[PDB]
Amino acid sequence: WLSAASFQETTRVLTDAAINCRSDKLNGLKENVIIGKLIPAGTGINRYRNIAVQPTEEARAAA
Amino acid sequence: GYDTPLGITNPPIDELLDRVSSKYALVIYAAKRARQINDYYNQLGEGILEYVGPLVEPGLQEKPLSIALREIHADLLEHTEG
Amino acid sequence: SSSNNSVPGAPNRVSFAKLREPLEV
Amino acid sequence: MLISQRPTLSEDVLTDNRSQFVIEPLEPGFGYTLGNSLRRTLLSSIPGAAVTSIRIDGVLHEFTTVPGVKEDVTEIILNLKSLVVSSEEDEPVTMYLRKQGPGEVTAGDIVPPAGVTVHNPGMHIATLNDKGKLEVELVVERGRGYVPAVQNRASGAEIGRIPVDSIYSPVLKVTYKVDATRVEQRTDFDKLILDVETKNSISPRDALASAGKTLVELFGLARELN
Amino acid sequence: MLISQRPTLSEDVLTDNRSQFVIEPLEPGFGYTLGNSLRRTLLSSIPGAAVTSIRIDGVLHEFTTVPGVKEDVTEIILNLKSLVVSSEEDEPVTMYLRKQGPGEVTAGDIVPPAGVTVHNPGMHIATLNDKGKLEVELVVERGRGYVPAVQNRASGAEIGRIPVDSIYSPVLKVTYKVDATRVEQRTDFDKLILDVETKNSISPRDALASAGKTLVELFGLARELNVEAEGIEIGPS
Amino acid sequence: LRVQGPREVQIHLVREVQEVYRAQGVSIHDKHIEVIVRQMLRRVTIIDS
Amino acid sequence: NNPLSGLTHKRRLSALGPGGLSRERAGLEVRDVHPSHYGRMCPIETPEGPNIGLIGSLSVYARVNPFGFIETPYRKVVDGVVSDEIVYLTADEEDRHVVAQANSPIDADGRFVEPRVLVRRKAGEVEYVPSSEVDYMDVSPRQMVSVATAMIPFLEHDDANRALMGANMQRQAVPLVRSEAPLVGTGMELRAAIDAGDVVVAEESGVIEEVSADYITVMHDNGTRRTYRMRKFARSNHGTCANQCPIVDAGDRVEAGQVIADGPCTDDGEMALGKNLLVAIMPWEGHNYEDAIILSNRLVEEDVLTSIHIEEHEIDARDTKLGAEEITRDIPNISDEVLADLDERGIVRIGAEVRDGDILVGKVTPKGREVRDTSLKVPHGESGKVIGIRVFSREDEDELPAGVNELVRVYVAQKRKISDGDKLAGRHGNKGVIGKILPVEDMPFLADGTPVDIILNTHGVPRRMNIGQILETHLGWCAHSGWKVDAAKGVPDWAARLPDELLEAQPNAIVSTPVFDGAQEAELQGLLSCTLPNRDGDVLVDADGKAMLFDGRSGEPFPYPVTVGYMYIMKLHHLVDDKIHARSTGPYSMITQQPLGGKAQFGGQRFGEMECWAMQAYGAAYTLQELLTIKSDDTVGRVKVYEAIVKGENIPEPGIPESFKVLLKELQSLCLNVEVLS
Amino acid sequence: HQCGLPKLMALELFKPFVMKRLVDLNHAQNIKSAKRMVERQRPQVWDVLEEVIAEHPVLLNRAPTLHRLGIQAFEPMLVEGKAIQLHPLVCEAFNADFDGDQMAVHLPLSAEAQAEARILMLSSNNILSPASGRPLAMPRLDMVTGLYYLTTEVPGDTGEYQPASGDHPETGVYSSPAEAIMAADRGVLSVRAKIKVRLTQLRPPVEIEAELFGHSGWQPGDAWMAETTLGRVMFNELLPLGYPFVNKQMHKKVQAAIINDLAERYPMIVVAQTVDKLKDAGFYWATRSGVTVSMADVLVPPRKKEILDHYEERADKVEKQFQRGALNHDERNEALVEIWKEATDEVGQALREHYPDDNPIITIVDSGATGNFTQTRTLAGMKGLVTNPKGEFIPRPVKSSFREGLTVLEYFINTHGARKGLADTALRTADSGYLTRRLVDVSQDVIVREHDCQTERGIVVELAERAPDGTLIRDPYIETSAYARTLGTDAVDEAGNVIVERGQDLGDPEIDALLAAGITQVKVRSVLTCATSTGVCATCYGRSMATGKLVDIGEAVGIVAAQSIGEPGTQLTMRDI
RNA sequence: CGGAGAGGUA
Ligand SMILES: O=C(N[C@H](Cc1ccccc1)C(=O)Nc1ccccc1N1CCS(=O)(=O)CC1)c1ccccc1F
Ligand SMILES: [Mg+2]
Ligand SMILES: [Zn+2]
Numbered sequence A: 001w002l003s004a005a006s007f008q009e010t011t012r013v014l015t016d017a018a019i020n021c022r023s024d025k026l027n028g029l030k031e032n033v034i035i036g037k038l039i040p041a042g043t044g045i046n047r048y049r050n051i052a053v054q055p056t057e058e059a060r061a062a063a
Numbered sequence B: 001g002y003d004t005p006l007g008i009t010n011p012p013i014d015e016l017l018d019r020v021s022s023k024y025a026l027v028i029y030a031a032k033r034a035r036q037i038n039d040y041y042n043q044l045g046e047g048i049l050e051y052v053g054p055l056v057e058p059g060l061q062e063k064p065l066s067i068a069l070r071e072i073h074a075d076l077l078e079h080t081e082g
Numbered sequence C: 001s002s003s004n005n006s007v008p009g010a011p012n013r014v015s016f017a018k019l020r021e022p023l024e025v
Numbered sequence D: 001m002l003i004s005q006r007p008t009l010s011e012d013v014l015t016d017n018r019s020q021f022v023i024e025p026l027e028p029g030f031g032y033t034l035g036n037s038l039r040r041t042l043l044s045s046i047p048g049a050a051v052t053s054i055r056i057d058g059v060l061h062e063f064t065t066v067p068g069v070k071e072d073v074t075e076i077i078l079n080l081k082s083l084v085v086s087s088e089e090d091e092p093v094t095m096y097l098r099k100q101g102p103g104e105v106t107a108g109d110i111v112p113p114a115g116v117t118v119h120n121p122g123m124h125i126a127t128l129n130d131k132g133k134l135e136v137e138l139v140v141e142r143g144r145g146y147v148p149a150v151q152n153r154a155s156g157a158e159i160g161r162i163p164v165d166s167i168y169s170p171v172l173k174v175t176y177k178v179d180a181t182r183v184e185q186r187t188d189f190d191k192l193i194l195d196v197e198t199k200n201s202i203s204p205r206d207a208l209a210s211a212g213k214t215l216v217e218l219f220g221l222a223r224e225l226n
Numbered sequence E: 001m002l003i004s005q006r007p008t009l010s011e012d013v014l015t016d017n018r019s020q021f022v023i024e025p026l027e028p029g030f031g032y033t034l035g036n037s038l039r040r041t042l043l044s045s046i047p048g049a050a051v052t053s054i055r056i057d058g059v060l061h062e063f064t065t066v067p068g069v070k071e072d073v074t075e076i077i078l079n080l081k082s083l084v085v086s087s088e089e090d091e092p093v094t095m096y097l098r099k100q101g102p103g104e105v106t107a108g109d110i111v112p113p114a115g116v117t118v119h120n121p122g123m124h125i126a127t128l129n130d131k132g133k134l135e136v137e138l139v140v141e142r143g144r145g146y147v148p149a150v151q152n153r154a155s156g157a158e159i160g161r162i163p164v165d166s167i168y169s170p171v172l173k174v175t176y177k178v179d180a181t182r183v184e185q186r187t188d189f190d191k192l193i194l195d196v197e198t199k200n201s202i203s204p205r206d207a208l209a210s211a212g213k214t215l216v217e218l219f220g221l222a223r224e225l226n227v228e229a230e231g232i233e234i235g236p237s
Numbered sequence F: 001l002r003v004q005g006p007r008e009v010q011i012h013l014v015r016e017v018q019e020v021y022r023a024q025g026v027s028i029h030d031k032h033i034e035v036i037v038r039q040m041l042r043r044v045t046i047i048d049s
Numbered sequence G: 001n002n003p004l005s006g007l008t009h010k011r012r013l014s015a016l017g018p019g020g021l022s023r024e025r026a027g028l029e030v031r032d033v034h035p036s037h038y039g040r041m042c043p044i045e046t047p048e049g050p051n052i053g054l055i056g057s058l059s060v061y062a063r064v065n066p067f068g069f070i071e072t073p074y075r076k077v078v079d080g081v082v083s084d085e086i087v088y089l090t091a092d093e094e095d096r097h098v099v100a101q102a103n104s105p106i107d108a109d110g111r112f113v114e115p116r117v118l119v120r121r122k123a124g125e126v127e128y129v130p131s132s133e134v135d136y137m138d139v140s141p142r143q144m145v146s147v148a149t150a151m152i153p154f155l156e157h158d159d160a161n162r163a164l165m166g167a168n169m170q171r172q173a174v175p176l177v178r179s180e181a182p183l184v185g186t187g188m189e190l191r192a193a194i195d196a197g198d199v200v201v202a203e204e205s206g207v208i209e210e211v212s213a214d215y216i217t218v219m220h221d222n223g224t225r226r227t228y229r230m231r232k233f234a235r236s237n238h239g240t241c242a243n244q245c246p247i248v249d250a251g252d253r254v255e256a257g258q259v260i261a262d263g264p265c266t267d268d269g270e271m272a273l274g275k276n277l278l279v280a281i282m283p284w285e286g287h288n289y290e291d292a293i294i295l296s297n298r299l300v301e302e303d304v305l306t307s308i309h310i311e312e313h314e315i316d317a318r319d320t321k322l323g324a325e326e327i328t329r330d331i332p333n334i335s336d337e338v339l340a341d342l343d344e345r346g347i348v349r350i351g352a353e354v355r356d357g358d359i360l361v362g363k364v365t366p367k368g369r370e371v372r373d374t375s376l377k378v379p380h381g382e383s384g385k386v387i388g389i390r391v392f393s394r395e396d397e398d399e400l401p402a403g404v405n406e407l408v409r410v411y412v413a414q415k416r417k418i419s420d421g422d423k424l425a426g427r428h429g430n431k432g433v434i435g436k437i438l439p440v441e442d443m444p445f446l447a448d449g450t451p452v453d454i455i456l457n458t459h460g461v462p463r464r465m466n467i468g469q470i471l472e473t474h475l476g477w478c479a480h481s482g483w484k485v486d487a488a489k490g491v492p493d494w495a496a497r498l499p500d501e502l503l504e505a506q507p508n509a510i511v512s513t514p515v516f517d518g519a520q521e522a523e524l525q526g527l528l529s530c531t532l533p534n535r536d537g538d539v540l541v542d543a544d545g546k547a548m549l550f551d552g553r554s555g556e557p558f559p560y561p562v563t564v565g566y567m568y569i570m571k572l573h574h575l576v577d578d579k580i581h582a583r584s585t586g587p588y589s590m591i592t593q594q595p596l597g598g599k600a601q602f603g604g605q606r607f608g609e610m611e612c613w614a615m616q617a618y619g620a621a622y623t624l625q626e627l628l629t630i631k632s633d634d635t636v637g638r639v640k641v642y643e644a645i646v647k648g649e650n651i652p653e654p655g656i657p658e659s660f661k662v663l664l665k666e667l668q669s670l671c672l673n674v675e676v677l678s
Numbered sequence H: 001h002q003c004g005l006p007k008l009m010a011l012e013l014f015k016p017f018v019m020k021r022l023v024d025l026n027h028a029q030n031i032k033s034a035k036r037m038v039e040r041q042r043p044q045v046w047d048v049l050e051e052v053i054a055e056h057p058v059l060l061n062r063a064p065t066l067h068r069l070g071i072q073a074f075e076p077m078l079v080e081g082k083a084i085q086l087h088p089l090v091c092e093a094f095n096a097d098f099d100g101d102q103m104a105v106h107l108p109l110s111a112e113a114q115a116e117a118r119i120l121m122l123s124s125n126n127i128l129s130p131a132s133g134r135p136l137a138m139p140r141l142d143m144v145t146g147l148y149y150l151t152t153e154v155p156g157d158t159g160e161y162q163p164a165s166g167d168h169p170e171t172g173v174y175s176s177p178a179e180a181i182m183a184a185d186r187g188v189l190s191v192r193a194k195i196k197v198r199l200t201q202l203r204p205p206v207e208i209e210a211e212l213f214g215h216s217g218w219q220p221g222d223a224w225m226a227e228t229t230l231g232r233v234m235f236n237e238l239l240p241l242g243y244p245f246v247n248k249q250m251h252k253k254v255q256a257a258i259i260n261d262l263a264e265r266y267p268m269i270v271v272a273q274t275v276d277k278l279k280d281a282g283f284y285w286a287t288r289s290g291v292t293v294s295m296a297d298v299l300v301p302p303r304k305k306e307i308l309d310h311y312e313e314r315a316d317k318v319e320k321q322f323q324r325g326a327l328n329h330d331e332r333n334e335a336l337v338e339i340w341k342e343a344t345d346e347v348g349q350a351l352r353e354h355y356p357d358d359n360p361i362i363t364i365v366d367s368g369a370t371g372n373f374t375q376t377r378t379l380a381g382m383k384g385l386v387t388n389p390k391g392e393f394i395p396r397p398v399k400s401s402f403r404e405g406l407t408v409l410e411y412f413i414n415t416h417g418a419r420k421g422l423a424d425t426a427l428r429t430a431d432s433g434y435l436t437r438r439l440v441d442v443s444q445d446v447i448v449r450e451h452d453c454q455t456e457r458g459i460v461v462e463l464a465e466r467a468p469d470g471t472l473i474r475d476p477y478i479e480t481s482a483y484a485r486t487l488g489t490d491a492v493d494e495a496g497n498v499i500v501e502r503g504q505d506l507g508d509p510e511i512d513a514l515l516a517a518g519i520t521q522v523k524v525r526s527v528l529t530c531a532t533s534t535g536v537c538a539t540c541y542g543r544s545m546a547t548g549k550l551v552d553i554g555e556a557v558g559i560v561a562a563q564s565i566g567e568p569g570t571q572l573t574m575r576d577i
Numbered sequence I: 001c002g003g004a005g006a007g008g009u010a
Helices: A010-021 A029-034 A057-062 B023-042 B066-075 D031-044 D074-080 D204-219 E030-044 E073-081 E206-223 F007-024 F030-040 G003-010 G160-172 G190-194 G457-464 G468-481 G521-531 G610-617 G621-633 G636-647 G658-669 H008-011 H014-023 H029-038 H043-054 H088-094 H111-119 H144-149 H175-188 H205-212 H230-236 H252-265 H267-288 H303-321 H330-353 H362-365 H373-380 H408-442 H506-516 H559-568
Strands: A050-056 B077-080 D008-015 D018-026 D046-056 D093-100 D103-105 D127-128 D135-145 D145-146 D164-170 D173-179 D189-198 E011-016 E018-023 E047-056 E085-087 E103-106 E116-118 E124-128 E135-145 E161-163 E171-172 E195-199 G010-016 G053-057 G071-078 G081-089 G116-120 G126-129 G206-211 G214-220 G225-229 G259-261 G273-280 G294-295 G309-313 G360-362 G363-366 G372-373 G383-389 G404-406 G409-416 G422-426 G432-436 G560-573 H002-006 H059-060 H071-078 H104-108 H195-199 H224-228 H448-450 H459-461 H498-500 H523-525
Touching: A029 G190, A029 G457, A029 G610, A029 H008, A029 H506, A050 A057, A057 G621, B023 B066, B023 H111, B066 H111, D008 E206, D008 G003, D018 D031, D018 D204, D031 D074, D031 D173, D031 D189, D031 D204, D031 E030, D074 D127, D093 D103, D127 D135, D127 D164, D135 D164, D164 G010, D164 H043, D173 H175, D189 D204, D204 E030, E018 E206, E018 G160, E030 E195, E030 H205, E047 E073, E047 E085, E073 E124, E073 E135, E085 E135, E171 H175, E195 E206, F007 F030, F030 H408, F030 H559, G003 G010, G003 G160, G003 G190, G010 H559, G160 G422, G225 G422, G225 G560, G259 H506, G273 G468, G457 H071, G457 H088, G457 H373, G468 G560, G610 G621, G610 H267, G610 H559, G621 G636, G621 H111, H002 H008, H008 H014, H008 H071, H014 H029, H014 H043, H088 H267, H144 H230, H144 H267, H175 H195, H175 H230, H252 H267, H303 H330, H330 H373, H498 H506
Parallel strands: G294 G432, H002 H071
Antiparallel strands: A050 B077, D008 D018, D018 D189, D046 D135, D046 D164, D093 D135, D103 D127, D145 D164, D173 D189, E011 E018, E018 E195, E047 E135, E047 E161, E085 E116, E103 E124, E171 E195, G010 G053, G071 G081, G116 G126, G206 G214, G214 G225, G273 G560, G309 G409, G363 G372, G383 G409, G422 G432, G422 G560, H059 H071, H059 H104, H195 H224, H459 H523
């Protein structure tokens, strides 16, 4: 309902959502932009943002 | 087969993209390594905690991201995706 | 051949016009 | 096919401040390059003298008018921008101008000290009708090129001082033409004719000598290799 | 007056016959004043020697092919035109080339007089693959710059003469560029980056020195008009 | 869509948009229009609950 | 901006207002040119934005009758004989007749030379009709254009779009320190300058008695006198300078209606909005690429395109609930060096140089001693000379508003030279910013050694269908050089219809080519083919209008001849000094803790929705997150980021922005139960 | 990859970094002193600023941001002035000219933001258009004119090649390009004169290499005789070392093809360097190409009056037939719109035939730099037919050209049309943004999520339907339907072996092989049939048009699709269906 | 710097 209300017809969407008691799972680009969270695309995806970096054993020994 | 790269365009991006699966992986790789280098520099004034300093001879005022990209180019690191 | 003759102290600017103006602006 | 004749320079005096210099023989294709090098040096890097700032008696800035003169002080600055002065000193010197009553103020009314001299009396500066008095103090200085006005903040000057743009260029107009000799025996050479016109502050010979000294100094470094 | 830059010359060696010079601290506008004059002096002032004409036995009327030689006449002309030679005698000299039977004709198979020398003896000229013979005589002179072929209006001396374009200058190629070389509140100072390529008969440093000498001599003409006129002084090294 | 099926309407829409854009001399790959048309065909209307 | 802008502003007709059209709802058919506009509203001069077609300008000869309908004069013809009897007709009246053009051949009397005449009819229709059926006739071929559009030479050679742009851009020129009238004009400049009213005109005949930079005294014939005061270095509504200069001597005799002093953009009583510059029409090394312009350095050394701009700063001292905030030089915790320019009262001294952050009026307010400093400063990027101070004090029974004691005002002026980023323009819709300013030593120069002042690219002329600039360049070279038609044995056939007094001219001659009745192509060719030599005795521009130039950087002559001449360039009020802005931190809005917007507010650049779309398409998540959280409205993130940067640390993580909380509060105010589940 | 940034703006954007460095270098004792020093712009801050801004990327944006390339990252370098210096090769991407435009500058702070700006958004990494794959950072306008002039062969020029005449050998053959350059400097040779040259550092074309060296290869340093012009040697020296010699005149399309080949066969750094070199050469040679505008260059057709009289006779005959009872109003109007259309065409043809081939206007138009021949005909021929307030053509033509000057009644209607066009443009630009916003919203959550759904469905693309008599004719609209797609099933011809395997990018070589084998239709993978629950898979989407390789697993393709569809909406005019 | 209006640039 957040994405729909931010697009068009805010009043109608809000009244329908209130009557139906809709719950918004914040899974989307516009919703994450609104709440200030990392968008689930590009470099904000789990497989990318959770990379672990460390020097190699040989490079560490060469120190 | 190319003229010497100059400035932000060094090391070549084509060379870097061989080390990783995608460009996003390269972005996160370099960002995390740069954060590690900066933490090392900051803590050096107090003491070593968990990090390793530049693995390549840094420049006179080279910034952490450039050092991280040079270390990635000259194979010295390893990363694991999530 | 000039442009204007009504204003007293006007510069003498010569015109290429071939038509006479019956009415003044 | 080795010509062993060295170039020689000769002058033709068209008038007091205009002359032609002829240089020949030259290698084919070398006339334009030499001519343009000389022209650039003449037009850019010849030292001279110019007025750096002035101080009029009863004014505080250049956006005002003097009572009795028909020109606003800005127009007086623009008129003074056309002065040609030759200075023999190496430090700033001050000239004085003073006029009273009906008449015209011209560049011949300036009183220069020893060394400095005004070269174009009759220039025209302002006109005083009946009750106008003009008393302007001028500062002459030496330099080269074009230097914009130096603000009072940087110079630590008072409020009455009015900095002015300086143009230390004694040269006026320069051009060249090349006469080529292309015979079928390949005994070719060029002929360069350079015209120099100065604004009466110096002679074209002196400007050419200054350019030659500058160019010799610059090209002496490339010969240091040996 | 006195300048405040004192330009300095630097060299980068890219090969034994190619360098790249730099004159960094030049006043604004003196990059183009110096670069074009220096390039022209490099390319058209240094003296040298080259083959001016040749005469090949067996070809008089039609310049298409030489019997017993794989290569046509134009290839021979281009090969001899690439010979690097140095001569001292002012007047033209005459060489001779002659190899008999199968083999490879090389620039080292000629015997020049004591006044001439060949700097690339290994250069290839022609191959004899039909049990033939070759006999060509070369004419070498001294000069400066590039001189196209001079037509032989007086053919009475010989009818087999073939004039060729002479590359007298020992400098082959030159280029220059200008950039910006300052940050101290000023980004308008010029740079000059010459890229000189020369023959095997002289190194680029010697060519640059000779060009500087010639330019100094040329501008001494202007300097002599008034020896006490005021200019600009770079100052002592 | 009611007569021929979803694939036919998909090709119809893609062809119509592509021809409208080609008439002016603009080149766009079909994959973008396919993305949009895919987004336009995602639901079904119920008949019997 | 200048007299032309105000004159055209007064003669303006607008369709939108309390009882008119809407700037958005208006359709495409109310913005169109109607056949009934001919002679009543100009079809060229309109805005370019959403007001396209809704605001127009009155025509030259038009007037409004008592009922409010625009009229226009027509010359009556009887039995095919054009008489001299002007009658004004409304559109509905005009629709009942057929009117011929002003360019209809005549035979020294009213009789039409040709048997059939092309005439205008009711609904925008033209037909050939016998000469005995013609009712009326236009009074000139410029009856449809307006004042600003009538000052474009060779208008009929320019397409509508570029003519519209040129008419609009003539009203944006800034007055320059010194003015000069065009070499080639049209004649609608003397009257335009006189009617605008920025010049001083002699009301009655007399002899000038005393002339000074401040006044003129005229001794009338009947023994009376009248003194005219000149407004010097005044400030316009747009910050320009309005300075008047006398142009008469101490013994000259004047006539009633004669111009007695000049104005901002006037030269001898004629509009002078620009300068005449020697132009080249070649492409040059990519510096004039894609509408950019290349200028010589002479235009800066000689103050050719210099302007004076004046700023106004004011501060007031209120009563305040705390009480009695005062203007004085005693400001706490300020070095005595910083107070050097202030006088005893507490205001700067006239003639003092002021820079950014400098004190203009020292003031202290009792915030509660607790007296703080609330002095007047010089805004960012502003400087100049203090040229005047006006102070109103309630103690001197001044009509000040309620609750204020002092209202000091300060004026600072600065001269601006031409620099990269400033906007130039000609009269034919050609515009561009200054890409570069070259030394005089490396500009293309003619055989006699004359550098060219400006270089315009070739690739912009033929595509935009404004070929009147090339014709203006040719005629400008002809006028500057001078000419003499060699009519030794009769006048040449191309000069048969050329007016006498136009067969010869001196160097720097001013000529006029009216808007629709001016110079032809054959006449231009003829004039180009016969021009006077230069000082040495050589002709630099050949019969094609093209000259052979030299390369100023290498000295080699360019392989092919280039087109050179003189055209009229104006300096537009779009200077880059007023457009550069940067920010790192500053004021924030109170309802939502986001940066303020505006150069004057020291605001931030908006990162709208389409930029967010672009960032999402790139796949850049961290950049977008930081832009939205820690650069805009993360109250603690901002301070933490600043601390981290001023130290050697790395940036922290962001948090919830304040706008989301404001949205939640508004939704709750709408009686909606919004909750965040975890 | 560089942009010029004003010093005064750089000092303000990088304020905290400059303060930190001032404190570090002992120019101030605390942060307040450094802050005041920066506020006062003391002479000690510029030196530290120069080093502070080094290798710190900066984002530049110009509104409206119609597509992705409206934001790009550069490497700032301080300049003197208050205007920003923009590279000429990014104007097309930004859609920016220099008549008064302005741009915004943004500074990334964190390490991740800098990494994104330096990898994802760098200007030299975005050369190709994401919507179609065509290059956007390539020469245009002045550069095209310069390269077209350089790589042109003019018969019978100076120093041209001459065969042996029986008394002297061949003339016009040079032993190296250095000798040719020396001859050109001496004025004995022309850059556009056909010659014979010996080349050792340029790779011969495929035919010459095959018939001259064979198997082994060119092996730089091998000499071969070329028959071209000197300008073409100069142009080919600006291309990579191993690129085969190109002997052609460089129309804009030829340059675009060259750039596409380089992009698809070389790393992007080489492509960026090549485009920089081409920019330099084109700008240098456009100055010496001798293109100007003068009224002597605007030639008028020599027989316009005769053609106009010929067609006026037809118009008069039709009008008199209407005056008699033979046809109604509409028939007369249609007949008069015809006749005059043909007259305009004939005048255009005569104008085209009259002009010389080296005229500046003809050269600019034919070079592909900018413009078209309709404008040339309007300028030098006649404008032609105009349109009524309803859009229909008027039966009366405008017979004057802008070189002669339209009359006052031919200018009124011209202005009517021009203002109508301007208003329509405003309405169209207002209408396109709404469609773009709706398209973005509908498909904002279509994102690549897998690498392969292993689906067996697909779509069939015609791919050069066959001819009736028997022949394969390539389908005109094949690059937007068959290229950048993955195969769904093996391609087999007349019971033969598979020509292209399943899961192939299906580029130019694959399509050419398919056409040679004699197979028209091929089944491909499409997003319309992707089986992934959320988003799409890389194989179904296929190649990424911007990158030229299989799309990544995080790419947001819906926004790219929306921006690609909606961007060319103003060009697409708003013209009972 | 909260709101309304007017004008202008791309
Ligand atoms: O038509 C011409 N010129 C007329 C000239 C005119 C202007 C004003 C009043 C009366 C006549 C025109 O501008 N019309 C006009 C002006 C504005 C809007 C509509 C109209 N029209 C078009 C001709 S329409 O279909 O009959 C009826 C409506 C003309 C003259 C010479 C050569 C070619 C031409 F196309
Ligand atoms: Mg623009
Ligand atoms: Zn799939």
